[PDB]
């Protein structure tokens, strides 16, 4: 699951995945994190 | 080399490349394109 710290991060993350790129790449680019679990930590709620 | 339509694109491509993301991803995310020649096209001057 992807977890972002703010709306900016979610926006970039989403645009990046729509180009076809891998989740860790899009995470790094956006400041979001990829977790293996189903619930995002509280400081990455977006 | 990379060619960008505008400053916005050049900013994004460069930032993307500093994260280590592949040039085609950074191009898609920025609106820039990669060429094998030396002269950028006039519609991608930045």
From Swiss-Prot, chains A, B:
Disulfide bonds join 3-40, 4-32, 16-26. It is found in: Secreted. Belongs to the plant thionin (TC 1.C.44) family. Thionins are small plant proteins which are toxic to animal cells. They seem to exert their toxic effect at the level of the cell membrane. Their precise function is not known. This is Viscotoxin-A3. The chain holds residues 27 to 72 of 111 of the full protein.
């Amino acid at each position: 699951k992807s977890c972002c710290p703010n709306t900016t991060g979610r926006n970039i993350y989403n645009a990046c995945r729509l180009t076809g790129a891998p989740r860790p790449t899009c995470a790094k680019l956006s400041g979001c994190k990829i977790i293996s679990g189903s619930t995002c930590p509280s400081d990455y709620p977006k």
